[PDB]
A paper describes a structure:
Each sdAb recognized nucleoprotein (NP), a critical viral structural protein enveloping the RNA genome as part of the viral ribonucleocapsid and also a vital component of the viral assembly and replication machineries in concert with VP35, polymerase L, and VP30 (25). Here, using mutagenesis and X-ray crystallography, we determine the region of NP recognized by the sdAb and, in so doing, discover a novel tertiary structure of MARV NP. The last 64 residues of NP visible in the crystal structures primarily consist of three alpha helices associating to form an upper V-like shelf of the two C-terminal most helices (arbitrarily named 1 and 2 counting back from Leu695), with the third descending between them to re-appear after a turn as beta sheet positioned under the C-terminus. Electrostatic surface rendering reveals an asymmetric basin-like depression between helices 1 and 2 with helix 3 forming the basin floor with a hydrophobic core of Leu676, Val691, and Met683 at the closed end, while Leu663, Leu695, and Tyr667 reside at the upper more open end.
Numbering used by the authors: 1 to 119
Write the structure that this text describes.
Amino acid sequence: KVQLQESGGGLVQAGGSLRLSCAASGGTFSINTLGWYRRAPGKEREFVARISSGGITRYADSVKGRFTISRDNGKNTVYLDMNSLKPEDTAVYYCMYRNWGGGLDVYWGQGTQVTVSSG
Ligand SMILES: [Cl-]
Ligand SMILES: [Cl-]
Ligand SMILES: [Cl-]
Ligand code: NA
């Protein structure tokens, strides 16, 4: 019963910065965990980041020190601010909505491409 909408992403120069966002509706946003996974060309889908209802963050080692995840319960939106980007970050990024309220246990976004080019 939750719908997700991803925004942002696209082409960006190595070393540069890029924001992804994901907006949800239909659930109880304030109590749920939001995050991102990604699938890079060589690889299978992997955890990138998540943020609890209470603002507690977690990052995969691959992006720790470079990515910041945040949320605005006012707009039902989660943000992924990506910095120091490199070709290893080229991938399809999927929004994640881990549910503690009514509905399915988890919902996934359709995926947003991020492509890192030379600097
Ligand atoms: Cl929601
Ligand atoms: Cl997770
Ligand atoms: Cl962490
Ligand atoms: Na809200």
